[PDB]
Amino acid sequence: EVQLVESGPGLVKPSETLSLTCTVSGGSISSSSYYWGWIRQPPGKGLEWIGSIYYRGSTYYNPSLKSRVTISVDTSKNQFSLKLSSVTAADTAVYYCARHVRSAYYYGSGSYRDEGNWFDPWGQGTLVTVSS
Amino acid sequence: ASVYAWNRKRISNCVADYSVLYNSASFSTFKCYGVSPTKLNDLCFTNVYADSFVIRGDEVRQIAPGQTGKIADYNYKLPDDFTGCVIAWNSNNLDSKVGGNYNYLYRLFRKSNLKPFERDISTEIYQAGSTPCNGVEGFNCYFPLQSYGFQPTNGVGYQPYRVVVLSFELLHAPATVCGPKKSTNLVKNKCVNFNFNG
Amino acid sequence: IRGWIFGTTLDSKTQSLLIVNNATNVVIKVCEFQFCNDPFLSEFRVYSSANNCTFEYVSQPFLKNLREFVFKNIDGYFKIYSKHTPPQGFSALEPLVDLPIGINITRFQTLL
Amino acid sequence: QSVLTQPPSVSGAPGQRVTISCTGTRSNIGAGHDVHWYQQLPGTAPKLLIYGNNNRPSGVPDRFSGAKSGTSASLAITGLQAEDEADYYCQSYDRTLTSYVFGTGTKVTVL
Ligand SMILES: *[C@@H]1O[C@H](CO)[C@@H](O)[C@H](O)[C@H]1NC(C)=O
Ligand SMILES: *[C@@H]1O[C@H](CO)[C@@H](O)[C@H](O)[C@H]1NC(C)=O
Numbered sequence: 270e271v272q273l274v275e276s277g278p279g280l281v282k283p284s285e286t287l288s289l290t291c292t293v294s295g296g297s298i299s300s301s302s303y304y305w306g307w308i309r310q311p312p313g314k315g316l317e318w319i320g321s322i323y324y325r326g327s328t329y330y331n332p333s334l335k336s337r338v339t340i341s342v343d344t345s346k347n348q349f350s351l352k353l354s355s356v357t358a359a360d361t362a363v364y365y366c367a368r369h370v371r372s373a374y375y376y377g378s379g380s381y382r383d384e385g386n387w388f389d390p391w392g393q394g395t396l397v398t399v400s401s
Numbered sequence: 402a403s404v405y406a407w408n409r410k411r412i413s414n415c416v417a418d419y420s421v422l423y424n425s426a427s428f429s430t431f432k433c434y435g436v437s438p439t440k441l442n443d444l445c446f447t448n449v450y451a452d453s454f455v456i457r458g459d460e461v462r463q464i465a466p467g468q469t470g471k472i473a474d475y476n477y478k479l480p481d482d483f484t485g486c487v488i489a490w491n492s493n494n495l496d497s498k499v500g501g502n503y504n505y506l507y508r509l510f511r512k513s514n515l516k517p518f519e520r521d522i523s524t525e526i527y528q529a530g531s532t533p534c535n536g537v538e539g540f541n542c543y544f545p546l547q548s549y550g551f552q553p554t555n556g557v558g559y560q561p562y563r564v565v566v567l568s569f570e571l572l573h574a575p576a577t578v579c580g581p582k583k584s585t586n587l588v589k590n591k592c593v594n595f596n597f598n599g
Numbered sequence: 600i601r602g603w604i605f606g607t608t609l610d611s612k613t614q615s616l617l618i619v620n621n622a623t624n625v626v627i628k629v630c631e632f633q634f635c636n637d638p639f640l641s642e643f644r645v646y647s648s649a650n651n652c653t654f655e656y657v658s659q660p661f662l663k664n665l666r667e668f669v670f671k672n673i674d675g676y677f678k679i680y681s682k683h684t685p686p687q688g689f690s691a692l693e694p695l696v697d698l699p700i701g702i703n704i705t706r707f708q709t710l711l
Numbered sequence: 712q713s714v715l716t717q718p719p720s721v722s723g724a725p726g727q728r729v730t731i732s733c734t735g736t737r738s739n740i741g742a743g744h745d746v747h748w749y750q751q752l753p754g755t756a757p758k759l760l761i762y763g764n765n766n767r768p769s770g771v772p773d774r775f776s777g778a779k780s781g782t783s784a785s786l787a788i789t790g791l792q793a794e795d796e797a798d799y800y801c802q803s804y805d806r807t808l809t810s811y812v813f814g815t816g817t818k819v820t821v822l
Contacts (some may be wrong), residue, residue: 301547315714315800315815316757327539331810333713363754372543374762379509381529383541384761386747387802387811391756411653575675575699 271295273366273392277334282401287353289395291366298342298349304369305349306388307340311362321369322349356399363394403505404476404564406521407454407547414577417442417449428490429562432464435484436569442580448570449578452477452518455505456494458551459558461489464566475508475545478515485568496561497553504563509546518566602710605670607703610634611650614702615679619710620660627665629654629700635636658674667692675701715739715746715801715814724822729791731817733784733801739812740803741782748786749778749800749813757800761786793821 277289291305298305306321320330322340330338339352349366373385402408410570419442423431431438456464456472463470467481510527528534530541538544551561583596601622606615611633619626628650638645640670661683669680669692677700716734723729733746740746748761759768761777764784774789784803788795801814 297743303544316802316813317713318811318813323539325537325539327537329809331713332808341778376765379529380764383530383744383804384811386745386759386804388757393753419636578701 271368271390273368273390275364275366275392275395277364277395277397279396280398280400281356284355284401287351287356287360287397287399289351289364289366289397291349291351291392293347293349293366293368294333295390296368296370297344298322298347300371300401302371304384304388305340305342306351306367306369307338307351308365308367309360309362310365310394316365317362319364320351322343358399361396361398361400365394366392402454403507403521403549404454404456404472405450405506405508405524407477407518409518409520410451410453412449412451412578413447417578417580418578422488428488430461430489430564431465432465433486436486438486438534444569444574445575445579446569447572447576447578450566450568450570452566452568453566455492455549456489456507456562456564457551458491458562461562463566464489464564471509471546472507474514475511476515478517478519479566480517483568485566487566488565489515489562489564491557491560493551493553493555493560495553496563497551499553502551502561503548505549505551506547507549509544600709600711602664603670603707604632604645604710605702605704605707607705608634609706609708611648614653616700616702616704617618617646623655623660625660627654627656627658628652629702638710645710670707672704675699677704712736713805713808713810715803715812717799717801717814717817719815719817720820721799721817722822723791725791725793727791728794729788729819730821731786731788731799731801732797733786733814735782735801735803736805736807737782737813738807739805740779740784744768744804746777746779746784746800746801746803748775749816750797752774753798753818760799772787774801791819791821792814795819796821 273290274292277287281287296303301324303324304321307319309317309319311317317396318331319334320338320340322327322328322342328340337354341383353360367388368390372380373382376381388389418441423438426573454477460472464477465486466479466483508521510529512527526534526538526544528542534542602619604615604617607613609615611631614631617628617632631650632646633648633650635647640711641676650694665684665686667682671678678697679695681695682690682692684690718732720791721729721731745763747759749757750760751757759772760766760775764779765777767775776787778785778787778821784801796819798816798818800816803812805812
């Protein structure tokens with residue numbers, strides 16, 4: 270009942286700004302402790318965490334990409350936007366957005382584990398290529 | 402009132418009839434510990450306290466002497482030596498609402514357990530993670546639990562229930578809360594046994 | 600002569616009786632009123648506090664003119680005896696009310 | 712650095728015991744915040760298989776177990792079945808990078 274959908278341009282030139290949009294259903298980005306994150310998967314490699322945003326507008330980004338990644342929310346449309354500046358061909362990859370249900374597993378310690386571990390639901394993903 | 406901030410009312414110096422309510426057969430839960438519930442308004446107490454709040458059906462079993470769980474540890478606690486009564490009835494028709502009724506909150510965090518029946522007076526924030534919060538509710542430092550989501554199409558465990566806990570205080574004071582004086586008709590010109598109000 | 604102030608400490612620390620004659624009605628409380636060095640009584644500066652307050656009652660006025668009263672505490676029931684006679688002579692004092700208060704009265708500073 | 716290390720593939724015949732290792736650093740698998748395991752088809756939403764080193768979410772067969780020690784972790788599949796042909800990822804929070812780092816992942820095939 271949870272749905273995520275990534276949208277954006279398939280080709281972007283290096284140094285430009287990439288804007289991806291995640292439209293979701295089954296939850297609201299306004300719920301207490303709920304989170305919305307962005308994760309990347311480079312060609313034939315593992316998943317790589319990019320960033321996260323909270324119902325309260327708090328947000329984190331991967332330190333090596335912190336200055337170039339930006340995540341924003343639109344509660345009215347239940348959407349999350351990710352902007353990446355000074356892109357390079359190294360950023361080519363499949364991007365996924367994901368839902369984080371309030372805190373952690375609430376049953377078991379009372380969600381007293383930062384964020385449990387991660388999320389569960391996933392979107393279809395969008396492939397973004399950076400080349401000139 | 403919501404369960405975290407339940408409403409206590411003192412009652413004294415009045416006439417009460419319990420068997421209208423206890424025999425009304427209108428409540429889903431009516432359990433009396435200590436005193437017999439069956440038509441025992443033949444007693445007089447100093448004060449009578451009525452604590453009203455709202456929970457869900459799944460949690461009704463937790464509002465009882467020496468019970469443990471979210472509500473009991475964090476919202477409303479009763480002592481094991483409870484000489485009183487608990488009444489509760491399903492209020493889905495009165496406390497639910499289309500699109501949900503989110504007016505009832507419950508406390509989800511506390512350093513300790515609740516010392517027999519207290520309520521959400523001091524309603525601060527508590528650290529639920531590693532280091533100081535120092536402000537705005539955030540990472541490893543948040544609010545207690547949310548609202549209750551009392552939609553009318555909920556499961557019974559998730560439906561609103563109204564709860565009233567009656568406690569009977571008998572201190573070293575003139576007791577004034579008694580119930581009825583079952584008078585009878587009088588007769589004349591015949592040897593009878595009489596009871597002329599005392 | 601309008602009423603009295605019965606209590607142990609006559610402050611917010613303990614409940615006390617402000618038996619008053621409010622000149623349209625008689626007003627009685629058992630609330631925790633605070634002390635007044637000399638509460639005057641057309642203004643009233645006796646009811647300094649109503650620290651929480653637990654009981655209030657009103658009634659008809661009592662009404663050259665000799666009023667006699669007896670105030671007794673007995674087993675927590677506080678009784679009151681009275682009469683009104685138009686001070687040499689003899690009479691008797693009928694009861695008016697018992698109040699099941701249950702408080703410790705050791706000072707009864709009259710109101711003025 | 713950014714990735715937990717797993718062997719890129721692990722295999723066995725149906726009914727065998729197949730284990731997947733997961734090599735981290737002091738900041739994640741070592742002194743971090745416990746390692747979880749994932750099991751989902753490539754490109755599709757993962758599903759939590761093991762939480763908190765050794766907990767199982769409901770729906771995960773009891774034959775999946777996790778273990779951690781020091782800076783290394785393992786997943787044990789105790790009786791490899793045809794359903795166990797998937798990718799498996801480990802994951803853990805890295806306190807030094809302050810990021811949640813997934814493993815590079817292991818594909819199992821029931822030969
Ligand atoms: C006492 O009398 C005054 C005016 O005579 C009136 O305003 C007030 O309501 C009365 N009762 C009180 C003060 O309890
Ligand atoms: C009044 O004082 C006596 C002295 O022992 C005490 O026993 C009694 O309980 C007191 N009354 C009240 C109402 O506290």
